[model samples]
Structures are given as structure tokens and as C-alpha cells.
Target: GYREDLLANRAIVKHGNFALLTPDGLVKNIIPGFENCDATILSTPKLGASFVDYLVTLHQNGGNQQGFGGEGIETFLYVISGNITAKAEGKTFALSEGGYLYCPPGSLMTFVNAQAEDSQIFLYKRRYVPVEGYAPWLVSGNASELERIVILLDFLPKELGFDMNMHILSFAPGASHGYIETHVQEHGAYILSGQGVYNLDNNWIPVKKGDYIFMGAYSLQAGYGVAFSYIYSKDCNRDVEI
Candidate 1:
């Protein structure tokens, strides 16, 4: 069930706390090109996010199509289930589960599903904060390698003028990231699979698959895995402006 009060305010945790959005409480919103798709806005300006918007999109049946990117907004897509055919930069590619891609600002890309089943994707959009001496580019890859429990593949790099990065952190059963981290970057995370308990602002919160979390800048955060869990979070990378 949806809670009106929780949905009314942006989930900002200034003192190390966090907000959780469960799957059952998410409300689907319709977009112009995504009318036929299941588009759920996880975080946006209405939710208190000033720099980015997060969405969980599902395309079912065949021939589903949508176009993304324009003006100053850049987009990132991560395939959660099934597959999708994406065409961008005059090239076409098939992305399956665990696949991810980045589309830079001003570049238009089309996504389509020719298969009969359903495909799930996590979409993120943000206004590009361009810095001099940098150029935009596109990159895509699958999550295969792990450094301890974290995936080695990164969708965004600093050289391309991207101020944020997306990556998957996988944990073994009963394992953790080893320490609580406090940083200036804010975070938006989606639980990919398994279960865990997160430590935010010195409080322990249980989390599971389909749960979304928002961590404000300078908040202390960490997690411990109950099962083999995987989580995806967007981390800010650019230097702060004085």
C-alpha cells in the first residue's frame, strides 16, 4: 500500500539516515513515449532529488519502443531481466540481464524489445554538468568480474565529463563492504537481489530485493549481507564547486 505522507516529501537523510521505497508501494507514471511501458518513478524532483531522477521500467509483449535522451539530459540504462535491443550512435546492440549502457547528453537512443516476453530496466536521468576539456561518449558492458564483492565494470568515467558513476556491489552470504563510509556524494540505490541490513545514521534497517534507498551527502552508510545480495548505486564523482 502507498503511504501518502512518505510520498509527499523527498527522502533526504542529511544526518546519515535514509529513505526506503519498496516495490509494492511504487506508483507507475506514464510518459509520452513510454505509454505502453510500465514506468515507475523511484526518485525525482517531487521526491527531493535535485540532480537526478530514477525509474524502473518494464516492457512486456513484443514491439515495445521508446526513445531517450535530449537537450541536456543524459541517460543510463541497466537491464534487470530479459533483454532489449538498443540503437544509438548509429549502432545496434542487444543487452541482456546484468547489461548496462550510458547515453550522453544530446544523443537520442531507441530501445525496443522484439521478444515475446517481458524485459525490466533501471533507467536514470540527470542534467549534464559539463566541464571544460571534456567530451561525451557512450559505453556498455556486462557485470562479470568482481573485486572482492564489487563489480569491475563502470558505465561512466570522469574523462567523459560524467560527474556520477553506476556500479553493482555483490556480497557473499554474511559478508559486508568491511566499513561504514561517510562521503560528500549522495547516493541512490536499488536492491538487485537477496537480502541485507543497512547501517544508516547509526541505525540498522533491514532491506531486501526490490527495495530502493536514498542517502544524502555526507551521511554515514554501510550494509551487511544476510544472503548473497547485489545492489546498484549511483555515486557522485565530480569535485564540488566553491
Candidate 2:
């Protein structure tokens, strides 16, 4: 703010499961059913990711009316902008700006701030691994049902038992994800447009769009940029634990 650099910043928390956080150095806390909302918690499980990521900022009446998760926890909402009103398990969604909602596993979610000023939601929670006699359902939509690498939620070979997956890595500008790949999966990226140079494992850094990167485990990503839409969450199917 005020043209930044009041002592410089572009945060990068050395690798203890990689990190890049930089929402101008972050700040916005107070979690508990999100009263007045303002939580910038990006990824938890201490960052090694199993799941938990947020960027909520809903004002004008606020949200999270006493409800988030329970039982086996499995929630997710994305509305990177304004107007919201999601309430799972009893359904009553009216998201905006590319909306999205999916709650399964002890379902219990709520939201507010249906518009007036600020609002930018992006959350996730994970803890649901089922297989035998599976059962899980509930889904919301927007983002016009995916495109340009935008597969906000996936269901595939894991016999539809889903473990994790959500993406929207659109590219442009000079474009260049030209290989910087890695194996194991672990990410929580959030940078929704215009900016570049990211390669956590190789440390090229300098991302944009409210930055939030934590790609531990096998970190190492690729990048290039400009018009660089992003929104990530990975760890799919199953099988990795020994």
C-alpha cells in the first residue's frame, strides 16, 4: 500500500514445505465461523498440506453463520470477488464471480455477505478418503463449467471416490510452463491473473495476484506469465501412503 516497500517485502518462507505468500505481506485473521470475515489463512496442516486454505474477506454483514465442517470435513468454496450466500446441506447458494461450492463429508457450511462492498472467498478443507461402498455428493457450479485448463473439480479413475483436484491454471502473455515439473503433488496456489515467474523448487519466485503458494512434498513447479490465471489445489485419487 502507499506504493509498498515501507521496509520491503515479497515474502518467501524458506522451504519447510515451500511457501511464497505475499498479499503485501499478509494480515487478516480472526477465525470462528467468520464473523465480519477477514481470514487470510492459506493452507494448513502447517503448510505441508492435507488441506485448509482460505482468503476470505467478506464485509457488509459478513458470513460463516456458525458452520464450517464436522465429521470427516470436506468443504470448498470459491468466489474470488463479491456477492455470496452459500449454505450447504440444506442448499441455498447464490454465489457470484465464478462461483463454486462443494461440501460433502459431514456437510455443514454457511456464508453471508450477499454484496455491498468487499467479498472475495476462496476456501478449502480436506479429510475424506473413502473407497468401499463409497458415498459422497453435493456440487455447485459457475466458471461456466470449465475450460482453458480450468477443471475446478475432477472425478476420474479413482472410482469416483475422489481425493482431491481443483484447478484453473490458464496461461497467456509470454506463456511458458515449459517444464519444471515434479512428482508427488502438493500445492495450494492462488494467483488469479496477470503476473509471472514462479518455480518454487528452483525458486524463480515473483508471482502475482494476491500470491499464495505452498507446494511442498515434491514442490517444484513451472512458470512464465502475463494474464496468468491461477487457482490450485491438488492431491488426487489416493495411494501414496506406505
* Model 2 spans > 4 angstroms off: 1-75, 79-83, 87-90, 93-101, 104-113, 121-130, 137-162, 165-182, 186-188, 191-201, 208-232, 240-242
Q: Top model by TM-score, which number?
A: 1
Looking at model 2, residue 132 earns an lDDT score of 75
TM agreement with the true structure for every prediction: 0.82, 0.32
Over all chains combined, what TM-score does candidate 2 have?
0.32
Model 1 per-residue lDDT tens digits across residues 143-226: 653233233335556464676677677666746353357767667778888777787778777767777787766678888777
lDDT (Cα, 0-100) at 211 in candidate 1: 73
Worst 10 residues of 2 by lDDT: 148-157
- The root-mean-square deviation over C-alpha atoms between each candidate and the true structure, in angstroms, is 4.7, 15.5
Residue-wise lDDT of candidate 2 within 61-176, one digit each (tens)? 78888888778878878898878988888879898987888787898898888988988888888888877776667778777665433123342223456677677666667554
